[PDB]
C-alpha cells in the first residue's frame, strides 16, 4: 500500500478525434508523447498525456 | 573429471550434430519424420603451386580469385556425376521415371534453348526456363562416338497421373550429330497448366548398343493429340532395356506463360485448363445446441450463407 512506483494516465489523441487510452508510466519521468493507433482516423497519430488517474 | 571439458561451444555443437546423426535406441525425430599415378601428378602440381611466390602473396592479400569456368569443366569430369545423381534423386526423377531404379550419369550432356541468335539460354539441372524461351527445340551437344535421346514432361499429364507426354524422341543417333536421328515425335512447346505449380521436364540419353527400329514408338508428324503422346518410361525402357542404358540427364522447371495459351489453342486445339490450389476446409468441432462460454461468433463459424433468410415470411 505504502509503496508507489508507477501511475496511470490518460493518453489523448492529438488529431482532435477524442479517442483516449490508458497507459502506465513511472512517476518520476516526464509526460509521455507516444504514437498510437487511433481507430477514428484508422492510422497512427501522436498522443499526449493529459491527466493522472491513480497511483500504481 | 578424467575426460577433458569443451573449451568452446563449437566443439560441443560439432559433437552434438554427429551424435544426432548416429542412430540411438531412444526414439528421435529422424525416425518419425524420415589411379595412383594420377595422385602423384596431382601432388606435383600442388608443389608447383606452393613454390609460386605470386600465389603465396596473392593469398596474403586475401583477394585471390579462381576461374569458375575452369573449375566447372574439371568438376564435371571427376566427381560431377555424383552431384548430378543427387539432383535427380532429390527431384524424384529416378522414382517417377524408372520406378526407383538409379543410374549414375556418365555422359556430360549439355542442352540450351536458343533465344534469337545473339545468345542461347542453357538448360542445367533444375534450372528455370520460361515457356517462351522453350518455344523452339534446343541445341543438344555431348562428347561421344548409336544414341537415343528422349524428352518428358514428368508432371504435365492432364488425364492420368502416372502417364507422361513426349516432346520429341530421336532414335538411332550416330555419334554426336543429331540431325541424322529419326524424328519419331515432333517437337512440342511446353504446356504447363495455369495454377498447377512448377512442372519438371527431364531430358534422357540412352546408350544404344545396336540400331533397333522403334516402330511402336514412332508417332505421326505433326501430332497434336495428348491421347497419343501418353507413355510410360518404365515399360518403354523395359521393352528396350537390352540395348538401352541411360547415361545423360538434364531437367528444368517452367511455369505457365502467355505462350502456353497459344500452345493450348492454336495447335492443341483445346480450351486451356485452369487450376487453383484449394486448402482443406477449417476444422470445427461438432455444433452444440447451447454454446456455453462461447462468443456470438460461434454461430457464424457453422453458417454457410451470409445473406438473411425469412422462411415462411
Amino acid at each position: 500500500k505504502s509503496k508507489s512506483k508507477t501511475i496511470l494516465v490518460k493518453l489523448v489523441s492529438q488529431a482532435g478525434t477524442g479517442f483516449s487510452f490508458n497507459h502506465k508510466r513511472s512517476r518520476l519521468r516526464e509526460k509521455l508523447s507516444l504514437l498510437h493507433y487511433d481507430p477514428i482516423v484508422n492510422k497512427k497519430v501522436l498522443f499526449v498525456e493529459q491527466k493522472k488517474i491513480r497511483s500504481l | 573429471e578424467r575426460l577433458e571439458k569443451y573449451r568452446s561451444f563449437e566443439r560441443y555443437r560439432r559433437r552434438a550434430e554427429q551424435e544426432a546423426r548416429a542412430p540411438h535406441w531412444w526414439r528421435t525425430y529422424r525416425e518419425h519424420f524420415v589411379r595412383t599415378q594420377k595422385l602423384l601428378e596431382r601432388k606435383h602440381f600442388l608443389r608447383e603451386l606452393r613454390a609460386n611466390v605470386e600465389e603465396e602473396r596473392a593469398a596474403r592479400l586475401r583477394t585471390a580469385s579462381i576461374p569458375l569456368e575452369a573449375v566447372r569443366a574439371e568438376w564435371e569430369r571427376t566427381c560431377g556425376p555424383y552431384h548430378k545423381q543427387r539432383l535427380a534423386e532429390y527431384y524424384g526423377l529416378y522414382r517417377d521415371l524408372f520406378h526407383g531404379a538409379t543410374f549414375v550419369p556418365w555422359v556430360p550432356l549439355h542442352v540450351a534453348y536458343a533465344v534469337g541468335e545473339e545468345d542461347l539460354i542453357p538448360v542445367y539441372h533444375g534450372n528455370e526456363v520460361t515457356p517462351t524461351e522453350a518455344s523452339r527445340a534446343p541445341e543438344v551437344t555431348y562428347e561421344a562416338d548409336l544414341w537415343t535421346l528422349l524428352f518428358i514432361n514428368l508432371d504435365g499429364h492432364l488425364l492420368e497421373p502416372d502417364a507422361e507426354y513426349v516432346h520429341w524422341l530421336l532414335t538411332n543417333i550416330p555419334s554426336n550429330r543429331v540431325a541424322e536421328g529419326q524424328e519419331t515425335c515432333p517437337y512440342l512447346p511446353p504446356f504447363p497448366a495455369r495454377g498447377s505449380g512448377f512442372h519438371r521436364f527431364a531430358f534422357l540419353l540412352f546408350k544404344q548398343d545396336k540400331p533397333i527400329n522403334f516402330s511402336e514408338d514412332t508417332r505421326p508428324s505433326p501430332c497434336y493429340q495428348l491421347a497419343q503422346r501418353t507413355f510410360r518410361t518404365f515399360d518403354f525402357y523395359k521393352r528396350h532395356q537390352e540395348a538401352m542404358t541411360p547415361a545423360g540427364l538434364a531437367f528444368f522447371q517452367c511455369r505457365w506463360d502467355d505462350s502456353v495459351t497459344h500452345t493450348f489453342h492454336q495447335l492443341l486445339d483445346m480450351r486451356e485448363p485452369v487450376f487453383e490450389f484449394v486448402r482443406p476446409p477449417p476444422y470445427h468441432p461438432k455444433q452444440k445446441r447451447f454454446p456455453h462460454e462461447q462468443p456470438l461468433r460461434y454461430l457464424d463459424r457453422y453458417r454457410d450463407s451470409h445473406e438473411p433468410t425469412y422462411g415462411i415470411y
Binding site: - | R62, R72, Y90, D155, A193, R200, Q225
Partner: protein, 141 residues
C-alpha cells in the same frame, strides 16, 4: 474434340512444386533448440579446421548441391584450405551450382562468432552478388 478431354483434378508430382510456389509446409516447432528449422533449404558450411565444405540440403535430409575444397577442380586452382580466400571462391562456385540448380532462395543460420568471422561474411557477400538469396520468402497460407 479428343483434345478437349481434361481430367477435373491435376496431379503434379514434382517434389518442389509447392515449395517453388511457396505453399509447401515448413517446420515451425523446435523453439527450444537452435537453429530454427523453418527453412525449405539450408546452407551448411563446415570449416572442419583445414578444409571448407558447403552443402545445400532439403528438410528431408538429402543434400542437393555441395561444394568442397577437396574437389580436384577447385583445389588445383585453389591455393590453400580454410581461410578468407577459402570461401572467396568455393562460395562463388557453390553459388554458380546454386544458380545451376535453380535454388534462388535459401536459409543461412550462422552463429554469432561465426557470423562475425571473415570467411563467412565474404561468403555471404559472394552469395548475394551472385543472386542467391540467403533469406527465403515467407510461406503463403
Amino acid at each position: 474434340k479428343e483434345n478437349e478431354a481434361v481430367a477435373p483434378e491435376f496431379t503434379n508430382r514434382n517434389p518442389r512444386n509447392l515449395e517453388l510456389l511457396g505453399v509447401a509446409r515448413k517446420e515451425r516447432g523446435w523453439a527450444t533448440v537452435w537453429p530454427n528449422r523453418e527453412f525449405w533449404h539450408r546452407l551448411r558450411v563446415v570449416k572442419t579446421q583445414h578444409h571448407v565444405e558447403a552443402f545445400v540440403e532439403h528438410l528431408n535430409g538429402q543434400v542437393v548441391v555441395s561444394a568442397s575444397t577437396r574437389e580436384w577442380a577447385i583445389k588445383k586452382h585453389l591455393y590453400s584450405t580454410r581461410n578468407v580466400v577459402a570461401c572467396e571462391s568455393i562460395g562463388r562456385v557453390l553459388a554458380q551450382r546454386c544458380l545451376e540448380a535453380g535454388i534462388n532462395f535459401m536459409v543461412y543460420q550462422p552463429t554469432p562468432w561465426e557470423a562475425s568471422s571473415d570467411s563467412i561474411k565474404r561468403l555471404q557477400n559472394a552469395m548475394t552478388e551472385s543472386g542467391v538469396m540467403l533469406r527465403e520468402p515467407r510461406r503463403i497460407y
